[PDB]
XYZ file of C-alpha atoms in Angstrom:
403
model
C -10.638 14.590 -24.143
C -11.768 12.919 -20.983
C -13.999 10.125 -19.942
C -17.032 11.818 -18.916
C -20.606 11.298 -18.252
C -22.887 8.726 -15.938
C -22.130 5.232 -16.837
C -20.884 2.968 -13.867
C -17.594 3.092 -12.050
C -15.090 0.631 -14.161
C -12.423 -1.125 -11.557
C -9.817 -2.982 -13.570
C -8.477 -5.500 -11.608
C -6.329 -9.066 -11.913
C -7.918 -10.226 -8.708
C -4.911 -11.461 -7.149
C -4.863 -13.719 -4.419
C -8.304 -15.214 -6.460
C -10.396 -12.501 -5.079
C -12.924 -11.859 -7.583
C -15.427 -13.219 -5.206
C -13.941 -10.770 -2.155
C -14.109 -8.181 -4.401
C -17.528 -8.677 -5.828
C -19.115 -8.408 -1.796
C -16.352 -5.273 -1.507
C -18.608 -3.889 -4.528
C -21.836 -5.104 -3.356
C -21.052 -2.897 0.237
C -20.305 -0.117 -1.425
C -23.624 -0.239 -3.961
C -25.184 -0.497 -0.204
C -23.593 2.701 0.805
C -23.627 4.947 -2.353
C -26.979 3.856 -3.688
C -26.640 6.386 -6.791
C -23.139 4.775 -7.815
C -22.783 1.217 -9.462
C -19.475 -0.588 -10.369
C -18.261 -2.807 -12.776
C -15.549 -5.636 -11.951
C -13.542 -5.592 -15.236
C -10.857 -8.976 -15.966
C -8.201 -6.719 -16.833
C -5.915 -9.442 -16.953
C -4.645 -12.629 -15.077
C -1.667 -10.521 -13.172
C -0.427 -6.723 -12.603
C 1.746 -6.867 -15.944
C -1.600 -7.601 -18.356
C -3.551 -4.670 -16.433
C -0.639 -2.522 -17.248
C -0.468 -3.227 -20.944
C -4.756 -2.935 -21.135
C -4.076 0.477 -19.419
C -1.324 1.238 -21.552
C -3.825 0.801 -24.766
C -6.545 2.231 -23.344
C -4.796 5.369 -22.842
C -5.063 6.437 -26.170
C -8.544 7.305 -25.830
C -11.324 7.464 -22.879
C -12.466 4.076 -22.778
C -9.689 4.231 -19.702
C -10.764 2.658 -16.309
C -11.864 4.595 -13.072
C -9.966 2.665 -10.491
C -7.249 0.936 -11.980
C -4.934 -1.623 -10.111
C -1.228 -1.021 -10.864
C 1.786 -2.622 -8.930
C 4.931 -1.495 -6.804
C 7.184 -0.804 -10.229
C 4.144 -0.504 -12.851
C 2.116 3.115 -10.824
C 5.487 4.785 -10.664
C 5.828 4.578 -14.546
C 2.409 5.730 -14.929
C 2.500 8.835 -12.878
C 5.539 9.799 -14.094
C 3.953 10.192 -18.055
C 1.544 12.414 -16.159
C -1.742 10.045 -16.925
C -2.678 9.539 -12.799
C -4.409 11.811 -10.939
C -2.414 12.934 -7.904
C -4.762 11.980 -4.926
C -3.632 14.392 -2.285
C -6.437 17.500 -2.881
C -8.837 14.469 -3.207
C -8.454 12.663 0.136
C -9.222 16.064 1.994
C -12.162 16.818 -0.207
C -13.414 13.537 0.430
C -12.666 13.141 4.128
C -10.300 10.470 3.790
C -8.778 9.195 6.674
C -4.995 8.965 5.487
C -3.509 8.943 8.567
C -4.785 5.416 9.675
C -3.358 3.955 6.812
C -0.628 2.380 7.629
C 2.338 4.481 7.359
C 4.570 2.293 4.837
C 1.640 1.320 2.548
C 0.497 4.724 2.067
C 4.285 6.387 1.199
C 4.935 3.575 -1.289
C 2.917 6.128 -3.199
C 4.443 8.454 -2.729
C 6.274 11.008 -4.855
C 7.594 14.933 -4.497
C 4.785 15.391 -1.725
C 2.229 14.059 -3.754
C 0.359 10.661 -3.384
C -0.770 8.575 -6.677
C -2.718 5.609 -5.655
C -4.318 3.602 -2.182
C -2.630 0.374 -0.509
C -4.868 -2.368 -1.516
C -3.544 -5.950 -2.102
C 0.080 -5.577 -0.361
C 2.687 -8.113 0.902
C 5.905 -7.834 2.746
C 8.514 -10.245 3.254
C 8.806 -12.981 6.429
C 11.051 -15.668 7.271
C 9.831 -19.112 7.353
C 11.372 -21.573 9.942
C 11.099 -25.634 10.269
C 11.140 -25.977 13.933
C 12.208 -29.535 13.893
C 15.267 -28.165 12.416
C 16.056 -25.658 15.049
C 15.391 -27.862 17.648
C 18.208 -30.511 16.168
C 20.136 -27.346 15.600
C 19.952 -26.399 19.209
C 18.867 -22.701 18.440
C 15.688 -20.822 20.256
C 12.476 -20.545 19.043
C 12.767 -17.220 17.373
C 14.004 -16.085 13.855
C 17.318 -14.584 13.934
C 17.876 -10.623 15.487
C 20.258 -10.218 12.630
C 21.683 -11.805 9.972
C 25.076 -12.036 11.358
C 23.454 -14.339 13.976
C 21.492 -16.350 11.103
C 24.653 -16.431 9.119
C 26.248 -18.447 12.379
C 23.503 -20.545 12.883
C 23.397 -21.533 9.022
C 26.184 -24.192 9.444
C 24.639 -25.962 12.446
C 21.464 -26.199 10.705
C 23.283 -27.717 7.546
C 24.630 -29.981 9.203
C 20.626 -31.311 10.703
C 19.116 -31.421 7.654
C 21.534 -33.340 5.908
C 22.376 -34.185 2.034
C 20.319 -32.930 -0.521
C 18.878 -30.378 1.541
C 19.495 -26.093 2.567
C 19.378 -24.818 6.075
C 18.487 -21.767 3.572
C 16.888 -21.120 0.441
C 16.984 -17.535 -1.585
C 14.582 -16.738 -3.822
C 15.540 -16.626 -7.661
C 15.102 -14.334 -10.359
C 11.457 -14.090 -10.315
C 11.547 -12.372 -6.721
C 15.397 -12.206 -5.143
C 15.272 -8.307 -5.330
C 12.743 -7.666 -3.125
C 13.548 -10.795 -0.931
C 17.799 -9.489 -0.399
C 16.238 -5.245 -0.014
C 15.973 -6.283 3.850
C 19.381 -8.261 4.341
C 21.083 -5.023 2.435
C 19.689 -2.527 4.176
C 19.941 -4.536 7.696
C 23.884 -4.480 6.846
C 23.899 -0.507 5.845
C 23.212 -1.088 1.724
C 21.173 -0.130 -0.701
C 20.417 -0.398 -4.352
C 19.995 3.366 -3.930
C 19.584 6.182 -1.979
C 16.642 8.238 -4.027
C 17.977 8.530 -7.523
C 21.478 7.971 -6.841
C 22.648 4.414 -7.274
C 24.867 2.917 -4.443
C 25.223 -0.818 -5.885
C 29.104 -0.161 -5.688
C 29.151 1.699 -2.453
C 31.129 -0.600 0.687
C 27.990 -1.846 2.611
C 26.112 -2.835 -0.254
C 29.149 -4.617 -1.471
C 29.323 -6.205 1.777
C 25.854 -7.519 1.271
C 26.110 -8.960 -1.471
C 29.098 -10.814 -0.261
C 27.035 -12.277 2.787
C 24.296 -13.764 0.639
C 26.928 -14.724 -1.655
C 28.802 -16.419 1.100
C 25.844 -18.194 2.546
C 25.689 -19.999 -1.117
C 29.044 -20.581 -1.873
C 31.957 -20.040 0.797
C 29.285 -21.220 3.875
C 27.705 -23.194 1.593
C 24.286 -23.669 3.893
C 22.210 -22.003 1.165
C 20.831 -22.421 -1.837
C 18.717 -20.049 -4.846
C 15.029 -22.207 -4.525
C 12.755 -21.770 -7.817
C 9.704 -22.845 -6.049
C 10.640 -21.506 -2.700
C 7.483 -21.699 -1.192
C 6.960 -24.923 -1.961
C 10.461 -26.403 -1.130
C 9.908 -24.927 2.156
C 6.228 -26.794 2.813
C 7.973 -30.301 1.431
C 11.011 -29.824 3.970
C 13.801 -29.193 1.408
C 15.004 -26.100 2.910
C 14.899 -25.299 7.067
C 14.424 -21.908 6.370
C 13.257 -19.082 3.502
C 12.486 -15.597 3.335
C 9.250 -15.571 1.276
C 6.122 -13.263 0.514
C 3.340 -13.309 3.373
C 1.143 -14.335 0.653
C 2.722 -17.330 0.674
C 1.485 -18.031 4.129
C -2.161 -19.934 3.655
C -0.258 -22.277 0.906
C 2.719 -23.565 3.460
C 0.207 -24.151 6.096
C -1.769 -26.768 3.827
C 0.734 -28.395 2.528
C 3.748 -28.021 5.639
C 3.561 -31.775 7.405
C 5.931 -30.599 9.822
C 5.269 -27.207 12.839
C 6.956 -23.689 11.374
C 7.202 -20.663 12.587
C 6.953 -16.874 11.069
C 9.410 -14.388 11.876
C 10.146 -10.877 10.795
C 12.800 -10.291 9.319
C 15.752 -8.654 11.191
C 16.088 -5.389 11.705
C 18.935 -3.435 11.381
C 20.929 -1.435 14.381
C 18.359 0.071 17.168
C 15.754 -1.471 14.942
C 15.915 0.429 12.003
C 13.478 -0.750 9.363
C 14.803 -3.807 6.612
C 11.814 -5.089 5.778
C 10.180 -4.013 2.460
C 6.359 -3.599 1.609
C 5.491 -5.498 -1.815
C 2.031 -5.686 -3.934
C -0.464 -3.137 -5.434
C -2.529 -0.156 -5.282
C -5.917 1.540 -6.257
C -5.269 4.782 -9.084
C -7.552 6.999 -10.245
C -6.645 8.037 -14.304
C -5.902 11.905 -14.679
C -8.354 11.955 -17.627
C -11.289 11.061 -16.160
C -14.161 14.433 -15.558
C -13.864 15.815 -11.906
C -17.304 14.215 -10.833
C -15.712 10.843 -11.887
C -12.710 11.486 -10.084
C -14.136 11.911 -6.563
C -16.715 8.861 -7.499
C -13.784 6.780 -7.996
C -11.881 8.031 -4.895
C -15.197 7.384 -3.157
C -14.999 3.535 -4.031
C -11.080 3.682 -2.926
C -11.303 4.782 0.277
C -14.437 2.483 1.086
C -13.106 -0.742 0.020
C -9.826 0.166 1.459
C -11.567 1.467 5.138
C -11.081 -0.894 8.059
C -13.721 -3.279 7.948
C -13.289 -3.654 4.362
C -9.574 -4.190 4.241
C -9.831 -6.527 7.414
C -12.027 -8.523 5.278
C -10.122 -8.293 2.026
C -7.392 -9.873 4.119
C -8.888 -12.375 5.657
C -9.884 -13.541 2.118
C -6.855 -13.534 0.286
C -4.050 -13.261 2.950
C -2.711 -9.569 1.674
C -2.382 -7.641 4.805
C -4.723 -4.989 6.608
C -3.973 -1.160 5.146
C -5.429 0.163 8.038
C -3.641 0.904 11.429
C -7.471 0.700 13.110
C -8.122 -2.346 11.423
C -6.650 -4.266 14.135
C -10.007 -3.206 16.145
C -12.177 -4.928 14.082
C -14.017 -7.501 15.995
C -13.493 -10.227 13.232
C -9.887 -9.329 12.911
C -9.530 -9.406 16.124
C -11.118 -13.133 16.027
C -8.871 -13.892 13.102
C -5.600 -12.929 14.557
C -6.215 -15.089 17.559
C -6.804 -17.836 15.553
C -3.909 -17.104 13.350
C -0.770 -16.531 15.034
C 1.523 -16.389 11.980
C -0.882 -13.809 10.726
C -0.257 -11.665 13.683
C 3.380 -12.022 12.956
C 2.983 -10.300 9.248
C 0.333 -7.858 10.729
C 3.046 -6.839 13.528
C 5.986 -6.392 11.187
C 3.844 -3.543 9.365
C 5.074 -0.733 11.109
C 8.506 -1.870 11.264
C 8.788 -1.820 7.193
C 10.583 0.563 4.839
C 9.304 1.840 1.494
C 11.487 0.423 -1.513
C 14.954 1.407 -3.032
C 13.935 3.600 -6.162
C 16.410 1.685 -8.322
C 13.715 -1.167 -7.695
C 10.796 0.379 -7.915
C 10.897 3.249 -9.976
C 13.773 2.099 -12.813
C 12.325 0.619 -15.448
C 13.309 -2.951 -15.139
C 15.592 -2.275 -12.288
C 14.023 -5.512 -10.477
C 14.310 -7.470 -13.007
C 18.231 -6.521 -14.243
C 19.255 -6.588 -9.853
C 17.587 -9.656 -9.564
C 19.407 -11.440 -12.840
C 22.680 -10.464 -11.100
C 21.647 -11.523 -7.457
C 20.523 -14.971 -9.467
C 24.289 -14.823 -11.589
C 26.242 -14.499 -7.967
C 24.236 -17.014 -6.415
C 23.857 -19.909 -9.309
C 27.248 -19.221 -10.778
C 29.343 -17.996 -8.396
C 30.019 -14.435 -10.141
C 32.137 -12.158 -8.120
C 29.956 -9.396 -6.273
C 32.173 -6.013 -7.589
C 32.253 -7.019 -11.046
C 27.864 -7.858 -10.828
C 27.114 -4.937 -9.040
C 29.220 -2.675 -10.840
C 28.168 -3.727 -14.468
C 24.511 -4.130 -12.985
C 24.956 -0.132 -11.917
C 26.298 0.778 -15.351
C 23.542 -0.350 -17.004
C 20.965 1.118 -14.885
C 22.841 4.423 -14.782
C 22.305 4.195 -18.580
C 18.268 3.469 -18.113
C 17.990 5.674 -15.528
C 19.221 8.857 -17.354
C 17.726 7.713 -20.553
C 13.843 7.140 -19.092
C 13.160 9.004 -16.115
C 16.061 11.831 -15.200
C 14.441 14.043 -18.245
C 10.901 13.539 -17.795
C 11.495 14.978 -14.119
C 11.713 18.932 -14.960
């Protein structure tokens, strides 16, 4: 009934950010430091959906991984149908240091007290900004301190980029619910609060209606496909994007940018989400596999090893003492706009269950987000048939599996 016995350690990964070579020397370190453990790099597929289907499949028997790499939405789904091992009894067994991971990263993980996987490649929002633009615009040379400022500014910096161009772009479909979580919750919303959905509430409401504004009514933003990338070539002054898109608009920017957090809300409350994927360990695995593969987790996820996982692929550090490490101490200063990502970490929030934990619920917020801001569609009527239908999923998928 479970995967048993002395073969090696089988990590199922996508490699993302290109890491296979990172995580090869993550492997060899850790052959170094267990001598009687070995570990196989599987290709389980060329992004976070294909490793979820191979896991999916390989469920049905025990040719199942040992450390398998599942995403913000895909672990949640997982755990729930009871096939994860819940990691909690585990870290104190093993000694593992939870408490200098960093707070958010670990309690994205998080569920009824009980912890289901390891930070490992994660991401959070930042806001890009072409500081030729601000200069024309007259503005300092910060991001905005909320979005009610930026929302001011947008006009000015319309007007200095000119025809053609966005003193703003928003993400589309492909990423516009994770990208708008900070705006709504900097203005009071929410997709939900736990399981109860609060699309429809006021604030959220109100939300909406500011990005919808900025697009329409405003007018100084636009929905980007390639936001990244129409940042770099100067299309749009300014973009709320993933910190992995960091390394690829400094190659290709020809102009100076800056990195900003995104605003906070009142008396800095957190609106900034975390993003990315973490390390599980398959609840039918033997017990002597278990803590072998908890072993690997917590070493390439300690602080010299996520400091270097980061400096190779641009995710972020998971460790709160990985700021201490001498090259990531050497990197930072180097890297100013990484520091900028690295210090937003404890200022982030975990995400909005409706996103997260609803099956599909970023894709079917982010098709309406897309609908108000291509087509114009009127917030109340989006949200609320948006909420319907997720009412619907949510009762029909997860609210029974949860007794």
């Amino acid at each position: 009934s479970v995967k048993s016995g002395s073969g090696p350690i089988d990590f199922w990964s996508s490699h993302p950010g290109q890491s296979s070579a990172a995580e090869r020397e993550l492997i060899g370190r850790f052959q170094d430091r267990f001598p009687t453990l070995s570990v196989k790099l599987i290709d389980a597929g060329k992004d976070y959906d294909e490793v979820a289907q191979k896991f999916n499949a390989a469920l049905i028997g025990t040719d199942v991984p040992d450390v398998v790499l599942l995403d913000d939405r895909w672990w949640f789904h997982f755990a729930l149908s009871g096939v994860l091992t819940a990691l909690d009894d585990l870290f104190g067994q093993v000694g593992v240091d939870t408490t200098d991971y960093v707070d958010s990263l670990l309690a994205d993980y998080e569920f009824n007290g009980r912890h289901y996987a390891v930070p490992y490649a994660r991401s959070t929002p930042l806001f890009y900004y072409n500081k030729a633009a601000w200069q024309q615009a007259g503005l300092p040379d910060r991001g905005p301190q909320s979005w009610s400022e930026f929302d001011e500014w947008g006009p000015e910096l319309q007007r200095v980029v000119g025809a053609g161009r966005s003193a703003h772009g928003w993400a589309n479909a492909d990423l516009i619910s994770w990208t708008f979580q900070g705006p709504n919750w900097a203005f009071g919303g929410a997709y939900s609060d736990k399981w109860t959905l609060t699309l429809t509430e006021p604030a959220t409401i109100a939300a909406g209606n500011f990005y919808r504004n900025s697009i329409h009514g405003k007018g100084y933003a636009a929905v980007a496909n390639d936001i990244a990338n129409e940042f770099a070539t100067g299309i749009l002054a300014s973009a709320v994007a993933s910190t992995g898109s960091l390394a690829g608009i400094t190659a290709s920017a020809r102009f100076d940018f800056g990195a900003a957090p995104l605003p906070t809300g009142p008396d800095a409350a957190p609106a900034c989400p975390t993003g990315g994927a973490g390390l599980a360990i398959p609840a039918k695995l033997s017990e002597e596999r278990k803590v072998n593969a908890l072993k690997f987790i917590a070493f390439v996820t300690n602080p010299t090893n996520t400091a270097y996982f980061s400096q190779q692929t641009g995710y972020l550090p998971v460790r709160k003492s990985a700021v201490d490490d001498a090259s990531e101490r050497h990197y930072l200063a180097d890297n100013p706009r990484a520091r900028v990502a690295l210090d937003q970490l404890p200022h982030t929030r975990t995400q909005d269950y409706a996103r997260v934990f609803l099956p599909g619920g970023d894709r079917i917020i982010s098709a309406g987000l897309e609908s108000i801001g291509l087509r114009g569609a009127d917030v109340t009527k989006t949200f609320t048939n948006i909420q319907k239908r997720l009412q619907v999923i949510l009762d029909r998928q997860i609210m029974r599996k949860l007794a």
